[PDB]
Amino acid sequence: MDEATWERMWKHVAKIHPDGEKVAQRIRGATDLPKIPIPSVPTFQPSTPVPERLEAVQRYIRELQYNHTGTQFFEIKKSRPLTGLMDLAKEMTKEALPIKALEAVILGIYLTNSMPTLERFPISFKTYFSGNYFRHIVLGVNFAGRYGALGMSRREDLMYKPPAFRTLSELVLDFEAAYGRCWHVLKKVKLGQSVSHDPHSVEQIEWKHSVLDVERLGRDDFRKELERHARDMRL
């Protein structure tokens, strides 16, 4: 990154960290800092079952670390054609910097395009906690009729899910329960369509094909609308 963005990051650090400038004083120019290995982009034998591949993909995502610096290192324009987002995903693997939820979704797509028997679709959440709204996103996946997820979160139970849920409803209800355990109220769920496995596709990701108002729908219509989206995807 350029001089200007670099100084912007450290200026931001000074305002949000309590010790402020002393963090920058310790780190900037320090000579014996840990060398961070560049995480190895996972590659897969054809004998390896898809669920085991998903474990390796998620391990790679986790190795990059959640970005707590306050500065996003990759700009993600969500309307960009898939081929452009996949160029960005490659750049993410080469620069190997910390990431947040949306970056992990793009990486998850990039690293599973080699899995045509796996369907991938974004799942975004809108939640409410302590008078404020929060947004989060994961990459929902479907293998052999079971649902799981890839992603990046501050919390362990708001990202990776092995593909073992029998319905999309059960997957989303598991996220809702995890949010409840962190005292968030789940307000909306936005579900995208399946993403092409062609990394040179020029079509856009459809992020918000279904928008579910959890509170207005109620338990049974919530599940029914989730079942409808799953049907929409099997086309």
């Binding site: 650090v13 960290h17 780190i27 320090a30 840990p34 060398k35 707590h68 610096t69 290192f73 620069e95």
Partner: peptide
């Protein structure tokens, strides 16, 4: 090469910062 060196120095400082911010 000066470019790669600059990016590697930045990356090492980014991760050192990320640990500090994670611990906070």
């Amino acid at each position: 090469s000066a470019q790669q060196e600059l990016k590697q120095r930045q990356r090492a400082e980014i991760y050192a910062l990320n640990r500090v911010m994670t611990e906070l």
